């Protein structure tokens, strides 16, 4: 046999999950050349479809029937990306046949329709009403909160969570709906490393991902290498694509047996994800998944609009505050009274855990005590004094050699008056300190061979270790506001 | 009984089509008060549902079943607009019960499902494929044409057209798909009076309008007036709402027996409309219509994005063209040689049928002879020598008493040099004359008692009458470009 790489926690960061060479046993995959010649098929193809797709053969009406052949021929003879489906009866079972093409290869996926058509119609209507009602939401928090409960009410999943991804791709459960006896994961954080770059790519490219059974045994696709090119078949868009063994073990530790997740894509990146988890196997009919795929596209457009609105509104309000303060600084009797004003001062321009004003030897801390942090920052800046703007989200925490210390892990500053040490500072506390007061998801469970990290506790500890000593970073909005404020203060 | 106004061409522009007091016989309508008390019901309620909804009574589980009552209870107890539907078997038929509330009145519409779950699932999948595929179009013309052909392929309508409404609400068939034996209406124009303000409002508020059989006899609603307010029930959102007698006459003259239309709303105004016509009665199942309602919302958002992109691109191109012209005029030895350039002159900045350059007593016409027309415009402007910018879209056509005259219906004039009579003019020919180059959509048909205006040719003649002597008006973008050109030439 060829070489094989064992998937372990040390190498899973680069696991080739897009080319597993196997599919979930709830369906069968047929791979076809651009001329319709069968390149490879699944080992269970004879079990599900009752016919053998011998490589090098061509499909016939005796095998897949006329509807599948007409769909396929319309695909092979078409131009550009192809994606279609048809219903057909093969043997006794009714199969949903999904067709698509990728990297010049054509795929046919035979999925048994186990649910009744009446339920499929009702479930489609409910999904379509989500698609319609989601346009009425005024804010993304309301949207995610309402959609999570409506998605659970419709699908009946034991748990539904909405994830929102932060600047570093770390996940956060921002909304939840769950069975009464289930442990709540609301507010849990987990590191970006829990969803490898390849998985994030797949979540961005494919709007819906479904795992019918985590305890499944993959069915192989033979040959594993493409007969024409010595490379594995790229199953990136396959609906039946196998699951990584590590994610299976992770979900297994949580007792999750099935999952379905709906991606939210904004600006070409995975902005959020509705993830539905079930404690027992659960299949969602293909027409309903297609309705959720349209929901994903619509909700992504709505969330993009709502985020653009929220950003524009924050820029408007910030500009109004900035102009009001820039005027008052000249109009007021004292620049400290203006800048340090509890509501109209600089502390209201950038969301911060405190601020400090320094000018002509004068100092004043806002919402805290930051005099020594500013002093140490200046002592560091003295090694590179031409920095009129300074930005850090990872100020080094000092050793126990001093009782006073840099508890403000983040510092942002502006030198508005070089002549008299005119400095403006914004401070933020550790991103762990900003959350630890809310508790932690730490629990103990029966755990598989890979150990405790494949559990929500281990995931949260790994996040805590990643953001340890780091404050929430200054976004491009904050940096823009800071530079604009300096440009305004350059006149004063 | 109260008097009833006869709907005729003299008063049809004021017809209150939103309160017809009747519905189409393919379904039944029940009106309810906010407490669930029956206010009024359609005279066919017994024929379809098997029970009588006597005003003042309450619906019981024996009449409509628990599903309808649970949905209604949720609607009556919910806060804000309500809209939901459920599938239920009432008497001998399976119904799609659509519930909604308007002006504090609750309505229940029972529609018999004529198709099985199969076929409906396939039709819904096809509609969903359109919804997904329409996001791949990069231009509005390609979108409208492809959607028109795919909508015809799915629905099987004898004809499908895409109307695009203009600044004066006039319509134009910009795309068509039709049966081999059907007469083509591509490029037909019709006046705004063909769709009164109330019909436009309803097409904006309700994304789907269906007419199952134009030859139908409306089923009246009794009582005719709301017992709580003594006013007619507002059916603006009802899907069974009756059709005006005059549009039934119009479609009867066209030989059309059924119609379905999908609205395209951009900026809160009816931007366009896909209309499907059938030569025989045709019903579209409710789940499929809800799929097309989501298609209408998605298509409206896509068309809005595409039109915004096209407008921004036109502003970019116009800016570059204006700057290029200014540079060439600065580098050219003779300003006339640059301004009269066929590809980079004033004729390239604004869509026009002709232009004229005048300066220091020099005159030069572009794309034809406009010297005497410009002379007459100056004669009109000489009455107000302070007018530096003038535009008109209804230039009075001179009589036959002169061999030459103002043969231009549109005139846009700008003065860039008061001392040197520096003037720029753009001219546009009659809109009818502009269309006549593409053919004449006129034919004769059998006509009804309202006479020839309720025919496609009658609508074309009425449009010709409405735009006679008028050119396409100068839009805000054209005026902005013209003003910027004026300022740039003043700088030069
Ligand atoms: C309380 C719950 C909880 C969860 C579910 C969580 C993380 C999380 N993993 C996700 C997916 C994947 N993760 C890995 C691989 C790795 N898994 C690891 O743990 C490290 C060692 C590792 C690589 C270095 C792969 C291949 C996939 C793709 C699976 C596929 O679809 O084939 C997702 C996506 C959405 C979802 O599944 O709900 C989430 C949200 N964190 C928590 O606290
Ligand atoms: C060759 C084809 C062709 C067409 C189809 C055309 C006109 C046209 N009428 C439309 C609708 C309506 N018109 C009127 C009323 C008036 N109709 C008139 O003729 C004058 C007298 C009048 C009032 C003063 C009303 C109440 C409705 C609403 C009907 C309802 O209840 O749903 C539409 C919408 C789309 C559609 O119907 O497919 C179009 C496109 N003009 C053409 O050349």
Swiss-Prot record, chains A, B:
Residues 17-492 are annotated as: Chromophore binding domain. The lineage of its organism: Bacteria, Pseudomonadati, Pseudomonadota, Gammaproteobacteria, Pseudomonadales. Keywords: ATP-binding, Chromophore, Kinase, Nucleotide-binding, Phosphoprotein, Photoreceptor protein, Receptor, Sensory transduction, Transferase. Photoreceptor which exists in two forms that are reversibly interconvertible by light: the R form that absorbs maximally in the red region of the spectrum and the FR form that absorbs maximally in the far-red region. A tetrapyrrole binds at residue 12. GO terms for biological process: detection of visible light; osmosensory signaling via phosphorelay pathway; regulation of DNA-templated transcription. In the N-terminal section; belongs to the phytochrome family. GO terms for molecular function: ATP binding; identical protein binding; phosphorelay response regulator activity; phosphorelay sensor kinase activity; photoreceptor activity; protein kinase activator activity. The gene is bphP. Residues 139-303 form the GAF domain. This is Bacteriophytochrome. It comes from Pseudomonas aeruginosa (strain ATCC 15692 / DSM 22644 / CIP 104116 / JCM 14847 / LMG 12228 / 1C / PRS 101 / PAO1). It catalyses: ATP + protein L-histidine = ADP + protein N-phospho-L-histidine.
């Amino acid at each position: 046999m060829t070489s094989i790489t064992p998937v372990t926690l040390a190498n899973c960061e680069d696991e080739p999950i897009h080319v597993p060479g196997a599919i979930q046993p709830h369906g069968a995959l047929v791979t076809l050349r651009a001329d319709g010649m069968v390149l490879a098929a699944s080992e269970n193809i004879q079990a599900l479809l009752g016919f053998v797709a011998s490589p090098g053969s061509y499909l016939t009406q005796e095998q897949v029937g006329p509807e599948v052949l007409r769909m396929l021929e319309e695909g092979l003879t078409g131009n550009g990306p192809w994606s279609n489906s048809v219903e057909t009866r093969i043997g006794e079972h009714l199969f949903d046949v999904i067709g698509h093409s990728y990297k010049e290869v054509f795929y046919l996926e035979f999925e048994i329709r186990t649910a009744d058509t009446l339920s499929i119609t009702s479930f489609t209507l409910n999904a379509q009403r989500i698609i319609a009602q989601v346009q009425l939401h005024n804010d993304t928090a309301s949207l995610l909160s309402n959609v999570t409960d409506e998605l659970r009410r419709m699908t009946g999943y034991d748990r539904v969570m909405a994830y929102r991804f932060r600047h570093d791709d770390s996940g956060e459960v921002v909304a939840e709906s769950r069975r009464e006896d289930l442990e709540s994961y609301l507010g849990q954080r987990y590191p970006a490393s829990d969803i490898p770059a390849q998985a994030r790519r797949l979540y961005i490219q494919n709007p819906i991902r479904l795992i019918a059974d985590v305890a499944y045994t993959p069915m192989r696709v033979f040959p594993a290498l493409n007969p024409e090119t010595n490379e594995s078949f790229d199953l990136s868009y396959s609906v039946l694509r196998s699951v990584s063994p590590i994610h299976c073990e992770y979900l297994t530790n949580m007792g999750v047996r099935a999952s379905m997740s709906i991606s939210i894509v904004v600006g070409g990146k995975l902005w959020g994800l509705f993830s539905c988890h079930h404690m027992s196997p659960k299949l969602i009919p293909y027409p309903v998944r297609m309705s959720f795929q349209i929901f994903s596209q619509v909700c992504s457009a709505i969330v993009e609009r709502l985020e653009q609105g929220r950003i524009a509104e924050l820029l408007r309000v910030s500009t109004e505050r900035r102009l009001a303060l820039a005027r008052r600084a000249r109009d007021a009797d004292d620049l400290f009274g203006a800048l340090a004003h509890p509501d109209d001062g600089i502390a209201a321009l950038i969301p911060c855990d405190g601020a400090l004003v320094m000018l002509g030897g004068r100092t004043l801390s806002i919402r805290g005590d930051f005099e020594r942090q500013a002093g140490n920052v200046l002592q560091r800046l003295q090694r590179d004094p031409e920095r009129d703007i300074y930005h850090t989200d990872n100020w080094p925490q000092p050793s126990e050699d001093s009782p006073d210390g840099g508890d403000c892990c983040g510092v942002l500053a502006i030198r508005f008056h070089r002549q008299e040490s005119g400095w403006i500072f914004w401070f933020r506390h550790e991103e762990v300190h900003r959350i630890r007061w809310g508790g932690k998801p730490e629990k103990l469970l029966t755990i598989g061979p890979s150990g405790p990290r494949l559990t929500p506790r281990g995931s949260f500890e790994a996040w805590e270790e990643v953001v340890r000593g780091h404050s929430t970073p200054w976004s491009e909005t904050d940096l823009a506001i800071a530079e604009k404020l300096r440009l305004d203060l350059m006149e004063l």
